Ligand binder design. Structure first.
Ligand code: HEM
Length: 116
């Protein structure tokens, strides 16, 4: 669905139309923001350390692994999503690309079914 590109500092460089629909931030609003604006606390507070940690250590926790996370929308409502990260690099700098699958639908069916 969503695609998003950050600099090695977690600043949003690119923001696809999907993500716009997914998160409810227009591309402009979104560009030049910290990516943490898309998650809840406590994650939202740590995200930078998530990044400085990987930079100095080169140990991947999501990169090439993938994970299921809670994402936060603009109007504050949260959701699950599968998150994948790609490391590229341009202008000598490392750039990260997030691909996002919304899982709201699956989680809700699974709840509904559990409930019945
Ligand atoms: C909006 C919801 C998001 C959440 C909740 C989330 C959560 C996380 C978590 C949990 C980690 C490392 C976990 C650990 O240390 O065990 C992480 C690391 C990282 N995330 Fe975020 N993420 C989100 C979106 C994004 C997006 C869209 C990108 C764009 C590329 C991104 C880039 C990164 C990078 C580069 C790392 C370090 C690499 C690694 O840990 O392998 N994140 N994030």
């Amino acid at each position: 669905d969503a695609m998003i590109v950050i600099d090695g500092h977690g600043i949003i460089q690119l923001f696809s139309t999907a993500a716009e629909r997914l998160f409810g931030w227009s591309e402009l609003e979104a560009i030049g923001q910290n990516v943490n604006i898309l998650m809840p606390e406590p994650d939202r507070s740590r995200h930078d350390s998530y990044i400085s940690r990987y930079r100095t250590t080169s140990d991947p926790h999501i990169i090439g692994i993938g994970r299921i996370v809670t994402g936060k929308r603009r109007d504050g409502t949260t959701f699950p999503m599968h998150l994948s990260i790609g490391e590229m690099q341009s202008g000598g700098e490392p750039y990260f690309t997030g691909f996002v699958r919304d899982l709201t639908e699956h989680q809700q069916t699974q709840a509904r079914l559990q409930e019945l």
